[PDB]
Amino acid sequence: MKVQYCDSLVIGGGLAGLRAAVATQQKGLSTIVLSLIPVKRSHSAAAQGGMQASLGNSKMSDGDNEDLHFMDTVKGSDWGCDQKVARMFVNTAPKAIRELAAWGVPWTRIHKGDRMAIINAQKTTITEEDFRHGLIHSRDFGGTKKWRTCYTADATGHTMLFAVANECLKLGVSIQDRKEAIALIHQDGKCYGAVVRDLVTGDIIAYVAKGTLIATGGYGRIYKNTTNAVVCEGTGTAIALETGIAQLGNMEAVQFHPTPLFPSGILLTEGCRGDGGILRDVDGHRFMPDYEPEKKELASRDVVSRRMIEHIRKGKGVQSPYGQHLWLDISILGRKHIETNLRDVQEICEYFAGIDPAEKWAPVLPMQHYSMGGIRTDYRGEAKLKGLFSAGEAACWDMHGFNRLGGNSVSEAVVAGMIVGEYFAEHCANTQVDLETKTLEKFVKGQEAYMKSLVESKGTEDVFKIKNRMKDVMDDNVGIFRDGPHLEKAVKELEELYKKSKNVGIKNKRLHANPELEEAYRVPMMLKVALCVAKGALDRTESRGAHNREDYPKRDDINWLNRTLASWPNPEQTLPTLEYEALDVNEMEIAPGYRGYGAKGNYIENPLSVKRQEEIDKIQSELEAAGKDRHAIQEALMPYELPAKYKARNERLGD
Amino acid sequence: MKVQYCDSLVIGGGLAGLRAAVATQQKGLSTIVLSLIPVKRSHSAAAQGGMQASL
Amino acid sequence: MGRMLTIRVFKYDPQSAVSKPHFQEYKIEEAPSMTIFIVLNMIRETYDPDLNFDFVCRAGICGSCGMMINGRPSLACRTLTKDFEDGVITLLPLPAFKLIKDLSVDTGNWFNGMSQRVESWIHAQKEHDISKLEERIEPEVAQEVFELDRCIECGCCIAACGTKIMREDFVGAAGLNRVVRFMIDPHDERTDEDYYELIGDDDGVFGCMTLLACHDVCPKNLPLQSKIAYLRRKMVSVN
Amino acid sequence: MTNESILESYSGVTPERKKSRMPAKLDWWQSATGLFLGLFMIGHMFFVSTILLGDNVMLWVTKKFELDFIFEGGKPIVVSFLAAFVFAVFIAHAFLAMRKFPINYRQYLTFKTHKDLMRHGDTTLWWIQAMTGFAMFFLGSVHLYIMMTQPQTIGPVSSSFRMVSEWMWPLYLVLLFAVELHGSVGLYRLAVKWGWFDGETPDKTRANLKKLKTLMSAFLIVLGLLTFGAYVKKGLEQTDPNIDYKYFDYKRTH
Amino acid sequence: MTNESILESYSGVTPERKKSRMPAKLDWWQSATGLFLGLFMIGHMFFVSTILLGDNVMLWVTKKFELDFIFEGGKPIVVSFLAAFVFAVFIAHAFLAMRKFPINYRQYLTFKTHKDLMRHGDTTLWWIQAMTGFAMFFLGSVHLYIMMTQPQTIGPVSSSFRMVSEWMWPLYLVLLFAVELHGSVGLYRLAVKWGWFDGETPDKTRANLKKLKTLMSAFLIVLGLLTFGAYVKKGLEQTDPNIDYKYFDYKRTH
């Protein structure tokens, strides 16, 4: 038997996994990072929007702080987030940016002087004072009033990922790629590591550790149309689910992007619309103004996606051999503007769409983009399975709830990497594990037997046909608009698809470097993940954040102010087990209310919310009257935890 | 902490250690042989008398 | 219609004792805006699931899909079948990297080795306090560093380099660019002499024969030609 | 052998534990010797082409290089020292540049294959540099030794003699293209290698250098063929069996 | 480029998945070309030394190599083809053997240091082989081209002319030691490399081959100096300014 030991095992080489590995390796814990691919090729590398952090350096960022970022995050989540977690996040995001700047990330800097900027309310000029020169800049992204999205020109995710990966190399972290975790090793409710398949050699290996962290990204590829890399299939989610102990949170909470290029899904940054881009229909008609006379194309991202689909259903969509879509017109912004501020989007349309955005329109359609759902953890990042931690998009730390803020996800990856990293490090250094070879052998032999069964299967089902049908079902029934009747149909077909996945037969019999065998074991995992998403959507009879039920259009704070917890205790069951974790209003700093975007009064008010709100107003008044600062007030409303290393305040330009 | 696992650990790379390692490795047990020196330099190499066996 | 494309692919499995290097041809009907990414996945799902290749972002941002396309190392996800007036496309794995199987090679581990070799990280005596204001940097400088930080470690300039193909220890264009990327970063305290200890030898900057194929194939259009010359002038002046 | 060289050979570093500066020096000298020969050849093509202006013309120049304004009829021995000097640089350059040739079957096979697959201009031009360089080991040496040992045989009549009667034209014809292609490409790569003229628009500078390279080659090749024909024509007119053409030009002013 | 060469370059093996047989062929040809040149030179030293037997002697041999028993006064053009042939082998050999030179600073430094520390005869002799080989790139080419293009100038009188009047003796003097040391050591190593004569007592065979090598070199060097002096002496006696020595031997029987 092949066994590898390390003190800290990290599954996933994206921003979250690598940053967590820095956290453990720096304190002397031997850590291994496993990844399907070279770590610098992780999906994190594709982020071009930027990272949200309340620095308050620039003119449009002036006055920004933790409280404002916090409020944007909670209201954005439609109150589905754990507010204590959101607080931990907002207070640490500024330090994440500054640490990265220290590690060489080339953040775009502010230069003194006037600037030609778009505000879309007063597209006047912006002036940056001399005392702001040379500090980290920020732009308008995510719909926040205060511009706090930091960026390194047009490749933010790229530079961030490279810096963190390089720090891992500096520290001697063992980076092992083309390695896939296919099962978690657990006994007595504790996680002792993972069974790993070497993608090159086919070897099945047991990686044991005192602590294991899953930072495997999102599960967007269960959808046919997605902005996600082809490796974002949620197998990390599935292995946690298959332990029968760890639970998945809000899997039905999936966020879509309104303007990905159709049908590839290659992202066309929000900057297109933010700069003045226009959405048109089959007749070239600018339609957003018809639905949003006020906000128009500058409406909430959430609203734009919905209107686009509505317009398509009204029969104004553009017919295509790949389906219906709409048009994005940025040629109206001028050729000069596109070749200086949108030079990237120009290359994308030319390289893949074979068009020049300065002359022709780009085909677009809303598509799956971010996975709010994930492995459920406490505030420390630990799952119900002891010793198993999760961070990044793969987790449901839940600072996002039912709608993540644009710019908050790459921010969370590094921030969670830092925070969960510390707690993870503490767990690995303080816990003592009992590694029974009987258990290791059971799990390893169990997967070797499984690979053999797949290679010898005389089944007649085609793995790709099954996978493709799964993706169509998800797109057609679990998209922007959902309803009970279609969701019931989806759950039934997915369950049928799952059962047939077991009768798959493959042509290539080799155990090494076999992409067909890979699909043979990944698809069944994806189907179980899809079932959690679909079933979760079916049972959640309300409309919250990104989850919109046409048959239940209102947010229900009375019966649904909770979080969906999915599990798969019995390996025989063909549907996921769903339970619910209630959100205690008494522990909220901001009581449930209007989210800001969408129709007003579109939520069933909960009496407990009113009580808490009053209680909050009272506490604020008294404390604010006694000349108490925002910090002491925050503490009195909702105290939260933070590792000692990050409990310091964030200095700002103006203290 | 640095930890290395194998099914069969052999300490010593002389005739006895290496032959035992052959015995375990041939049946699929992962085995490691530890030695102060390259194994072919073990004291066993100095025997010039011979080996007793009733042929 | 859509004209029939003839796809010729290099196939070889070094881990299989019975495999022999050979080309296999596939007939694919072209579609609008069809890329090699689409072509290879079509072949995988409907004609030959044996074929190995690596795609991730399919957007030209991750550097995973480099391969030889009609003799030139290029990103397959960003290569259009339309640009080949002839209809015949030949695919080979990137040379100068360890072959895994067919079109799949190990670029990632060679790059991690290079990153370690040139100490690809910020070298500074003191850690700036992360709870305080960041150290100010001129915007133009940040822009210059970013320009060189754009490398996506795709390996195209490595495989395009005749020098690297012949002499495997050559650090490559990506390695020389990486050195410059830190040289011009104010956060890094290394001096020219420190850099010389890293690449001031025949496997380093002096091993470059200025073939410039690296410059001409870089999908991110980095200024390799001028930056390598810049480094050469600095290293030859040490001592 | 010295203690220091032993320590470097066995440790891989100098006694001060630093990497040797020799690779830098060798790189410098390779380019320096290359630059010298490249420029030398340009001037060489002009002075040797004076035959196109008339026998009296080049004859006048030939005497200047022999220090006419310092010696009576000019001492041809001056050309001998100049030849020996260039010969030395020629040898040093070959010695240093030879380090860059593909050196085994594997390197040769993989590079040649790569060159053919790539169809990359600058890569192919390097192969030409290497090929022409190897060829000049044999072609250049013959000419250099002769110029160094028979300087009194240089002139409108004498040079034409060697060109035709001594069958030197086949060598000159090949060498002309060999040294011109090698030299022009060499000067071009030298510019992009050290980037002396990069400036603010490197790609534009390189584009122009490439154009310049092609023109320089064209002009010099044609001028070389014209000059070549002149020497041949005259050499083909030397038919009198009672005339000592070899030392004719010399037999005019000692 | 061919499909097979591409497959070999990218896979490291032939289409049949075997290692290329080219390295074996190249090794064979390197030794074959070396053997040819080595033996050619021994015969060369004897035929060129006939000047010691008298002008009429070598003159007689010179005419035989020009096919006297087939043509009137013998056509010197025969020597041209022979020269071109040897030139070709000379070039092919240099091309193949050049693969063995130390090729970078590190290799040169470590081998030179090693040679000086070891004081091992056969190792030091290889360095000599390499040095003399490199030198002959320049020295051998000059002579080969001349013999190939001016065969009608070979003889007791004409050869002595070139030797002295055309200042070819300095080149011949260096080349004599260069080619003899290179050739004798080369033939010796060839024997121990392929072991054609090893037999039952290999060490004894090698001991004798080493002795033979030294004697062969001694004899040929001395004989070479004697022959050298003969050509010089005669060349130093050609003082009449009205005699065409260069083509004198030719002007006897067309």
Ligand SMILES: *Cc1cc2c(cc1C)nc1c(=O)[nH]c(=O)nc-1n2C[C@H](O)[C@H](O)[C@H](O)COP(=O)(O)OP(=O)(O)OC[C@H]1O[C@@H](n2cnc3c(N)ncnc32)[C@H](O)[C@@H]1O
């Ligand atoms: C898709 C996308 C997302 C995105 C964005 C643009 C695009 C096209 N732009 C953003 C932006 O401007 N601002 C922002 O805040 N977020 C943006 N996002 C989303 C964001 O980039 C992601 O949420 C974030 O990068 C996620 O980071 P994370 O570290 O969590 O995950 P990852 O980078 O995807 O990496 C996952 C790693 O896991 C390995 N893996 C996966 N499964 C396995 C198994 N089974 N075994 C072993 N390793 C596994 C992957 O290989 C990878 O390294």
Ligand SMILES: *Cc1cc2c(cc1C)nc1c(=O)[nH]c(=O)nc-1n2C[C@H](O)[C@H](O)[C@H](O)COP(=O)(O)OP(=O)(O)OC[C@H]1O[C@@H](n2cnc3c(N)ncnc32)[C@H](O)[C@@H]1O
């Ligand atoms: C000394 C001697 C013995 C001998 C002999 C001649 C001499 C000079 N001639 C013999 C003969 O003709 N016939 C015969 O039957 N026996 C003869 N012997 C004795 C015989 O050779 C020995 O008894 C026999 O070879 C012992 O074999 P064994 O496999 O037991 O041991 P070894 O070869 O000495 O190797 C010991 C290995 O252990 C490693 N080592 C030791 N300590 C450590 C620690 N702490 N950690 C890791 N490795 C360790 C050594 O490095 C070695 O490889």
Ligand code: HEM
């Ligand atoms: C008068 C004749 C010659 C001229 C004008 C000349 C000129 C040049 C020039 C300008 C360079 C550029 C050097 C550099 O890039 O640093 C060059 C390169 C080179 N030369 Fe020559 N050269 C001559 C003869 C030779 C000979 C006889 C050899 C034989 C070994 C040779 C082999 C090379 C090679 C292989 C290169 C490429 C070096 C590299 O890639 O670094 N040259 N030469």
Ligand code: HEM
């Ligand atoms: C200082 C040394 C040199 C001197 C004095 C010199 C002199 C001359 C002279 C006088 C000629 C005319 C024909 C003759 O007299 O045989 C000539 C021709 C020629 N030389 Fe040189 N040369 C020198 C170095 C070189 C070098 C290094 C090369 C290149 C390896 C070279 C290449 C040529 C060529 C190709 C021609 C033919 C010109 C044509 O036909 O266009 N020379 N040289």
Ligand code: HEM
């Ligand atoms: C008429 C002149 C020459 C003669 C008589 C000659 C003869 C020989 C002989 C007998 C060998 C043995 C070959 C073997 O071991 O397979 C040898 C080796 C060698 N020769 Fe030459 N050679 C001549 C010119 C040259 C030239 C111009 C070069 C220039 C590159 C050269 C470079 C070498 C080298 C470096 C070796 C050693 C090869 C090895 O170690 O494998 N030779 N030669």
Ligand code: HEM
């Ligand atoms: C088939 C080609 C060759 C022919 C016909 C030939 C002919 C001659 C002749 C006639 C001489 C007398 C002087 C003169 O006429 O200039 C001579 C001398 C000489 N040759 Fe050759 N040779 C040939 C090849 C070689 C080669 C390949 C080498 C070595 C690289 C060589 C080395 C010498 C030396 C060193 C002398 C001086 C003899 C002495 O002074 O002892 N020859 N050759």
Ligand SMILES: CCCCCCCCCCCCO[C@@H]1O[C@H](CO)[C@@H](O[C@H]2O[C@H](CO)[C@@H](O)[C@H](O)[C@H]2O)[C@H](O)[C@H]1O
């Ligand atoms: C062009 C100048 C070359 C520069 C000198 C240094 C590099 C070349 C010598 C070192 C490598 C040895 O080179 C080796 O030569 C033999 C020629 O006999 C080549 O042989 C191959 O090409 C030659 C020439 O096109 C063909 O006639 C032959 O059939 C073919 O098999 C080997 O593929 C090559 O690897």
Ligand SMILES: CCCCCCCCCCCCO[C@@H]1O[C@H](CO)[C@@H](O[C@H]2O[C@H](CO)[C@@H](O)[C@H](O)[C@H]2O)[C@H](O)[C@H]1O
């Ligand atoms: C003897 C013939 C050589 C065969 C040709 C192939 C091997 C040599 C060339 C390739 C290696 C480059 O060779 C490099 O040359 C320079 C000379 O300028 C040497 O330089 C060293 O030796 C030379 C000569 O004794 C000294 O004057 C010099 O001060 C010293 O530093 C380098 O130590 C060597 O590594």
Ligand SMILES: O=C(O)/C=C/C(=O)O
């Ligand atoms: O438009 C983009 O660049 C990113 C959007 C997001 O992260 O939501």
Ligand code: SF4
């Ligand atoms: S320098 Fe260009 S070609 Fe080379 S690895 Fe980086 S991005 Fe790819």
Ligand code: F3S
């Ligand atoms: S192609 Fe190679 S030789 Fe130098 S110029 Fe680029 S790294």
Ligand code: FES
């Ligand atoms: S798949 Fe990422 S660059 Fe091609």
Ligand code: NA
């Ligand atoms: Na998530």
